[PDB]
Amino acid sequence: ITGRPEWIWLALGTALMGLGTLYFLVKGMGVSDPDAKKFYAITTLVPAIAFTMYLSMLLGYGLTMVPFGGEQNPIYWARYADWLFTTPLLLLDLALLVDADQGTILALVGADGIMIGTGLVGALTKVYSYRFVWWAISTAAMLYILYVLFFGFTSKAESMRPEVASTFKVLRNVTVVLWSAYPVVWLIGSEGAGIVPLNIETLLFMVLDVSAKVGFGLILLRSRAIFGEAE
Amino acid sequence: ITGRPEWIWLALGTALMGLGTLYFLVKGMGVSDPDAKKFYAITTLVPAIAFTMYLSMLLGYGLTMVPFGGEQNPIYWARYADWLFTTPLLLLDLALLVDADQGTILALVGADGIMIGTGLVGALTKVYSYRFVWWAISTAAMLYILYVLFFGFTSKAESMRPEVASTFKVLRNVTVVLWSAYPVVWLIGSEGAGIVPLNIETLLFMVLDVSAKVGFGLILLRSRAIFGEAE
Amino acid sequence: ITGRPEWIWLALGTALMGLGTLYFLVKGMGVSDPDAKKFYAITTLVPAIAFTMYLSMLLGYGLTMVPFGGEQNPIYWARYADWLFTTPLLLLDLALLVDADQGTILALVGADGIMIGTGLVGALTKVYSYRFVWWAISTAAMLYILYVLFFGFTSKAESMRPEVASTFKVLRNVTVVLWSAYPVVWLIGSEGAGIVPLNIETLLFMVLDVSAKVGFGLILLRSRAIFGEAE
Ligand SMILES: CC(C)CCC[C@@H](C)CCC[C@@H](C)CCC[C@@H](C)CCOC[C@@H](CO)OCC[C@H](C)CCC[C@H](C)CCC[C@H](C)CCCC(C)C
Ligand SMILES: CC(C)CCC[C@@H](C)CCC[C@@H](C)CCC[C@@H](C)CCOC[C@@H](CO)OCC[C@H](C)CCC[C@H](C)CCC[C@H](C)CCCC(C)C
Ligand SMILES: CC(C)CCC[C@@H](C)CCC[C@@H](C)CCC[C@@H](C)CCOC[C@@H](CO)OCC[C@H](C)CCC[C@H](C)CCC[C@H](C)CCCC(C)C
Ligand SMILES: *C/C=C(C)/C=C/C=C(C)/C=C/C1=C(C)CCCC1(C)C
Ligand SMILES: *C/C=C(C)/C=C/C=C(C)/C=C/C1=C(C)CCCC1(C)C
Ligand SMILES: *C/C=C(C)/C=C/C=C(C)/C=C/C1=C(C)CCCC1(C)C
Ligand SMILES: CCCCCCCCCCCCCCC
Ligand SMILES: CCCCCCCCCCCCCCC
Ligand SMILES: CCCCCCCCCCCCCCC
Ligand SMILES: CCCCCCCCCCCCCCC
Ligand SMILES: CCCCCCCCCCCCCCC
Ligand SMILES: CCCCCCCCCCCCCCC
Ligand SMILES: CCCCCCCCCCCCCC
Ligand SMILES: CCCCCCCCCCCCCC
Ligand SMILES: CCCCCCCCCCCCC
Ligand SMILES: CCCCCCCCCCCCC
Ligand SMILES: CCCCCCCCCCCCC
Ligand SMILES: CCCCCCCCCCC
Ligand SMILES: CCCCCCCCCCC
Ligand SMILES: CCCCCCCCCCC
Ligand SMILES: CCCCCCCCCC
Ligand SMILES: CCCCCCCCCC
Ligand SMILES: CCCCCCCCCC
Ligand SMILES: CCCCCCCCC
Ligand SMILES: CCCCCCCCC
Ligand SMILES: CCCCCCCCC
Ligand SMILES: CCCCCCCC
Ligand SMILES: CCCCCCCC
Ligand SMILES: CCCCCCCC
Ligand SMILES: CCCCCCCC
Ligand SMILES: CCCCCCCC
Ligand SMILES: CCCCCCCC
Ligand SMILES: CCCCCCCC
């Protein structure tokens, strides 16, 4: 484990995702509202999945070597197995908050799968220049997601209860800022141009992951928007 | 790329799926009917997924070598990753058109997963004679799907609006004819008996894919069956 | 095939899953109740999936070698591909029986995916002591599932029709007893401590699989709880 300088950030990430999972699990014990139960189930699964994948990276299972640039490059593939399941769950939290229609939910989840799937292909591609073709396709899929979150959901939240509109607006802004950083870290990190070393890259993804999952969840599960209007 | 004679058909397929995706995306911009939005989302995702997998084959990522018959045989595995997601989406288009019940939808999607999954196992199997055992199981799963589309959905469409009944009947006939060709191309192509060479096999799958996805989508999204009855 | 002593139990399992699939398929022909159709579709898919994965193990495709303990250990990875899809389908049978809320269904299916996913990682892990870390995480996920089936569903079934309450109680008890045996067989078998040899381990999993899928299905599909109350 300790033979890799980035191990400290993988261990911290593992701990923070595990602690986040347990807090949400305990906090959700005393909840019977069927609407609130939906948000607790979605939001608790997110850091639980991330916990297992951070642990796999810490123990060395989620790491492979990819030859490109005449070098064997360490690629943590477990990140994409994490994101494949956690990013659509996070979008479902937002879509259920605004009572989005089914067709829009399917478009979001499908574009998200394309985003993560093409990012994985780009991470494992051995022809250096082709890695950035996949990065560009994946980034186009992300821009579609961000467009929908702004010019489809925002207008839908305003016609909703005030507390669900204000909570959505906050979580929307958090998501757009944090998610946009991921393609940048990829491009300048060891998967892309190799400007930033792997140990610093790992620290950046850990800050982003914890903020986008545990920070996101703390804002959502403390809001009254997750409960139905009741007397 | 150009070192493979089949590259021209992979490049054409990539272009036609990309163009198809963009047309459906633009055409769906001016749509607010929640029913129509469902069909546009399903139908636009189909060629978008196929685009990415054709590109992976063009660039050489979606290709592996499988030893059988005393030879290293080029097997494009990316086809099955495509079909795993696009064939159930196409069946969902048909099932939603006739307002099929949930139990029937699950049976269709499950049989479809078995069809594609066993076809993938057959494509990667190293014992030559066993490849055709998997082909037979996969073909049995397809025949179940075709039976349901005829002796379960057809009777359901007649009790529906006339425009949804006539549109379903057309898309049903297109699907049964085109899908039935796939097991035949597999059997006589490089995955099976090896009668037809890979470059011709690739041309045939490209014609079938574009017809079953973009041609299918053009018929559906030009129909009024996708809109609810409104004044 | 016959070069492996466990082949006899893989062949028996294949036959019993295939026969089970055909019986459920025939029995479900004469069913039009939309509620009953749901249970028949879920319950017939379970042994059909298991059939294909037992066949892959029989023919040698679903087997790999994992080095640990200074030895190349035969690991049947196809079991986890089976369980990944069949265990959530079995939980869906139970959840639909008691009309569970959506949030609870998602929590069950998500915990089940974590259970199977971490068990697969543990089966393929090359550092011997780490294999049991994954076993423990997977077992914690199972205990969560069992808790929900007892202290969330049981109370919900009592407020239901008497026949659905008594049928659920029976299937609940069958599930908790049979599922609990799996982590024990893993721990003492070739994936874990290696006390029980592989051929005996394979026999035990076959008895458990057939009971948990075909036996489970025979109890459910003979009950009147799967039909709506009708005159
Ligand atoms: C509606 C939305 C959900 C739609 C989703 C969008 C999606 C279509 C976007 C594209 C996804 C696609 C790129 C997934 C590729 C997975 C692949 C990286 C797995 C590893 O295989 C890659 C190479 C080794 O580098 O295999 C070496 C050769 C091996 C012999 C490969 C044989 C196994 C194949 C991988 C079998 C295909 C399985 C499916 C891809 C499983 C789904 C994986 C997940 C990442 C989507
Ligand atoms: C309700 C419906 C959706 C049900 C679906 C029906 C489905 C059950 C039908 C059978 C599907 C099954 C054959 C999928 C097999 C995937 C497999 C080809 C992936 C590549 O692995 C094959 C060998 C190399 O040749 O791995 C070499 C050895 C490696 C060490 C393998 C270890 C990884 C395992 C593959 C882990 C299992 C992952 C799941 C199979 C992922 C789903 C893939 C998709 C193709 C279903
Ligand atoms: C809501 C719920 C459904 C959530 C589900 C819970 C889930 C997150 C729990 C953890 C699942 C995770 C451990 C799955 C790992 C699959 C992995 C074993 C496949 C084989 O790859 C392992 C190594 C060889 O030993 O690959 C060698 C290196 C290769 C180069 C690997 C590159 C391919 C990657 C495997 C791509 C990721 C694909 C996804 C993991 C596909 C889903 C598989 C299924 C088992 C979940
Ligand atoms: C909890 C994890 C989250 C919210 C991860 C989000 C990840 C992304 C938005 C990743 C995007 C990428 C691109 C847009 C292209 C480059 C490759 C990716 C996958 C890093
Ligand atoms: C857009 C792609 C489509 C509609 C693909 C359809 C593919 C099939 C219907 C494939 C069927 C197969 C068999 C029936 C057995 C032989 C292997 C397959 C997977 C080619
Ligand atoms: C039809 C198959 C069924 C119902 C299989 C159930 C399997 C389990 C409940 C497996 C559980 C495991 C653990 C709890 C940890 C050890 C590894 C597993 C996956 C065997
Ligand atoms: C979206 C965030 C990207 C900003 C990356 C900042 C990295 C600064 C760290 C110093 C770079 C290390 C280079 C010298 C080793
Ligand atoms: C009462 C609110 C705080 C509860 C404690 C939460 C502990 C989980 C770890 C959170 C750290 C990361 C927060 C986002 C920066
Ligand atoms: C379902 C369509 C299958 C028909 C295949 C027709 C192939 C004819 C092309 C000529 C065969 C090439 C053999 C000589 C190289
Ligand atoms: C107005 C209808 C035609 C629009 C142009 C569609 C261009 C997408 C490519 C379609 C070619 C394949 C059609 C099926 C044979
Ligand atoms: C949950 C069931 C686990 C019980 C396992 C009993 C196995 C007894 C078979 C004899 C053990 C073989 C050891 C000598 C070869
Ligand atoms: C009339 C009920 C029996 C029908 C025959 C079922 C045959 C399928 C194989 C069942 C054997 C396994 C039963 C569970 C132990
Ligand atoms: C194995 C991959 C299957 C999933 C394909 C994605 C489409 C799923 C459609 C689900 C239809 C709704 C069923 C109720
Ligand atoms: C990782 C594979 C999980 C999918 C298994 C297929 C069954 C899914 C059941 C979904 C139940 C409906 C939830 C609302
Ligand atoms: C185009 C939709 C408007 C909202 C999206 C904001 C774009 C942020 C740019 C992200 C940069 C990634 C490289
Ligand atoms: C048996 C259901 C009737 C409709 C299915 C038509 C069968 C077409 C044969 C396809 C040939 C594939 C080898
Ligand atoms: C803790 C929830 C109560 C019901 C679960 C029964 C636990 C059975 C123990 C299984 C042993 C697996 C190692
Ligand atoms: C080795 C660098 C080659 C540059 C390729 C950049 C491709 C980016 C595509 C974005 C449209
Ligand atoms: C090398 C050819 C061996 C023939 C096997 C055919 C199997 C087909 C099974 C269809 C029932
Ligand atoms: C080689 C045996 C090492 C023992 C590790 C046991 C780990 C079990 C963790 C359960 C909390
Ligand atoms: C609940 C605390 C979980 C912390 C265990 C993971 C941290 C790795 C320490 C080496
Ligand atoms: C929108 C046009 C997309 C065409 C790019 C793919 C074709 C491959 C050319 C080499
Ligand atoms: C319907 C009977 C299915 C039996 C075939 C599988 C058994 C393997 C025999 C070698
Ligand atoms: C993106 C930063 C999240 C901050 C988490 C703190 C929330 C406390 C209510
Ligand atoms: C299967 C052939 C499809 C033909 C596509 C043309 C549709 C234009 C309306
Ligand atoms: C767990 C044992 C199941 C027994 C199956 C027999 C059911 C006949 C109704
Ligand atoms: C009005 C809410 C502002 C939230 C933005 C937070 C950016 C990290
Ligand atoms: C909408 C604000 C985008 C912020 C992008 C930050 C990328 C590091
Ligand atoms: C009555 C519609 C006929 C459609 C069949 C088209 C076959 C390619
Ligand atoms: C229902 C007509 C089937 C046509 C099969 C064509 C196979 C090449
Ligand atoms: C295995 C075939 C079953 C025969 C019919 C059983 C009575 C519905
Ligand atoms: C009251 C029903 C008892 C069922 C338990 C069966 C254990 C195999
Ligand atoms: C609730 C009874 C548990 C039985 C466990 C059996 C494990 C072999």
All domains in chain A, ordered by first residue: 1-231 (1.20.1070.10)
Ligand nearest to the CA of A182: 4
Helical H segments across chain A, by residue range: 7-27, 34-58, 78-97, 102-124, 128-150, 154-158, 162-188, 198-210, 216-221
- Where does residue A194 fall: left (phi above 0), alpha (psi -120 to 50 degrees), or beta otherwise? left
Contact flag B59-A106 (C-beta cutoff 8 Å): no
Q: Is the dihedral of CA A105, A109, A111, A112 positive or negative?
A: positive
Q: Is B64:B79 a contact under the CB 8 Å cutoff?
A: no
Which residue type does C51 have? F
Measured CA to CA, the distance from residue B142 to residue B150 in angstroms comes to: 13
For residue C134, the 8-state DSSP code is: H
Instruction: List, in order, residues 6 or more apart from C203 with CB less than 8 Å away.
Output: C6, C9
Which segments of chain B are extended strands (E)?
63-68, 71-76
Q: Which two tokens stand for residue B135?
A: 């082909």
Residue A87 CA, ligand 21 centroid: distance in Å: 24
A36 SS3 class: helix
Residue contact A52–C125, C-beta within 8 A: no
* Burial of B12: CB neighbours in 10 Å, binned 0-12, 13-18, 19+: middle
Number of other CB atoms surrounding residue B200 within 10 Å: 16
DSSP state at residue B107:
H
What is the distance between the alpha carbons of residues C68 and B46, in angstroms, rounded to a whole number? 43
| Residue of C82, C86, C109 to mutate, ligand 14, most atoms within 8 A of C-beta | C109
Kind plus residue range of the DSSP H or E element containing C76: strand C71-76
Counting ligands in written order, the one closest to the CA of A13 is 21
Q: How was this structure determined?
A: X-ray
User: Is A106's CB within 8 Å of B38's CB?
Assistant: yes
* Residues in A lying within 8 Å of C, measured between beta carbons: 34, 36-42, 44-45, 48-49, 52, 55-56, 59-61, 85
First to last CA, chain A: 54
- Chain A residues near residue C106 by CB distance under 8 angstroms: 38, 41-42, 45
Cβ contact A103–B56 (<8 Å): no
Place of tokens 């990430």: A13
C82: helix, strand or coil: helix
Could you give the CA distance from residue B17 to residue C197 in angstroms, rounded to a whole number? 52
The conformation of residue C218, written as its DSSP 8-state character, comes to: H
With beta carbons under 8 A apart, name residues in chain A contacting C129: none
Query: Which candidate from A106, A114, A124 shows the least CB-CB separation from B42?
Result: A106
Residue appearing with tokens 């060891």 = A190
Token digits for A109? 């989840």
Flag if A48 and C127 touch (Cβ within 8 Å).
no
Q: Please give the Cα distance from A53 to A62 (Å, whole number).
A: 7
Query: Hey, is A152 helix, strand or coil?
Result: coil
B72: left (phi over 0), alpha (psi -120 to 50) or beta: beta
Name every residue whose Cβ is closer than 8 Å to that of residue A140 and which is 6 or more positions away in sequence.
none
- Count Cβ atoms within 10 A of the Cβ of residue A178 and give its class: 0-12 exposed, 13-18 middle, 19 or more buried: middle
CB A109 within 8 A of CB A88: yes
Phi, psi of B190 (to 5 degrees): -70, -20
What's the DSSP call for residue A71?
Answer: E
Chain CA centroid to CA B153, Å: 19
Contacts of C121 in chain A (CB under 8 A): 52, 56, 61
Count CB pairs under 8 A between chains B and C.
46
Nearest ligand to the C-alpha of residue A150?
A: 15
CA–CA separation, B141 vs A188, rounded Å? 47
Distance from CA of C86 to the nearest CA of B (A): 11
Residue keyed to tokens 């609810």: B228
Stretch (H or E) spanning C87: helix C78-97
CA–CA dist B222, C105 (Å, integer): 38
Token digits of residue C110: 């998500």
Beta bridge partners of C67: C72
Nearest to B28, CA basis, from B222, B230, B228:
B222
User: Using CA atoms, how far apart are residues A96 and A78, in angstroms rounded to an integer?
Assistant: 28
d(CA A150, CA A154): 5
A46 Cβ partners below 8 Å, 6+ apart?
A: A86, A89, A90, A213, A217
Distance CA A40, CA A221 (A): 7
Single-letter amino acid code for the residue at B200? I
DSSP state at residue C113: H
Which residues on adjacent β-strands are paired with residue A68?
Answer: A71
Question: Is B56 within 8 Å of A110 when comparing Cβ atoms?
Answer: no
Q: List Cβ neighbours of C114 (8 Å cut-off, separation of 6 or more).
A: A48, A49, A52, C137, C138, C141
Question: For residues A168 and B77, what is the distance between their CA atoms, to the nearest angstrom?
Answer: 41
**CB neighbours of B205 closer than 8 A, spacing ≥ 6?**
B79, B182, B185
Q: Which helix (H) or strand (E) holds C7?
A: helix C7-27
B52 closest CB neighbour out of A103, A114, A127:
A114
Rounded to 5°, the CA angle A213-A219-A222 comes to 125
**What are the helix and strand counts (H, E) for chain B?**
9, 2
CA angle C117/A174/B45 to nearest 5° reads 55
Please compute, for residue A22, the number of CA atoms within 13 A of its CA located in the half-sphere on the CB side. Answer: 6
User: Which residue, among B163, B92, B83, B91, has the nearest Cα to B116 in the 3D structure?
Assistant: B83
- Our CA-based measurement puts residue B206 at a distance from the nearest CA of chain C, in whole angstroms, of 29
Residue of A nearest to C107 (CA): A41
Residue type, B159: S
A107, A213, C102 from A37: Cα distances, Å: 24, 18, 8
For residue B187, count other CB atoms closer than 10 A to its CB: 17
Contact A37, C104 (CB under 8 A): yes
CA distance C186 to B18: 47
Q: How far apart are CA C103 and CA C148, in angstroms?
A: 12
Q: Give the N- to C-terminal CA distance of chain C in Å, as an integer.
A: 54
Short-list B158, B50, B43, CA closest to B98: B158
Q: Which residues contact A159 (CB under 8 A, 6 or more apart)?
A: none
Distance CA B90, CA C126 (A): 41
Distance CA B88, CA B104 (A): 13
Identity of residue A194: G
Q: In sequence order, what are the residues at sequence separation of 6 or more whose Cβ sits closer than 8 angstroms to the Cβ of residue B174?
A: B211, B212, B215, B216, B219
Find where tokens 């070098």 sit. Answer: A71
Burial of B211-227, coded b for 16+ CB within 10 Å and e otherwise, reads ebbbbbbeebbebebbe
Buried b vs exposed e over A58-80: b needs ≥16 C-beta within 10 Å?
Answer: bbbbbbeebebeeeebebbbbbb
Give the pairing of strands B63-68 and A71-76. unpaired
Other CB atoms within a 10 A radius of the CB of residue C88 amount to 20
Other beta carbons within 10 Å of C29: 7
Q: Facing residues of B76 across strands?
A: B63
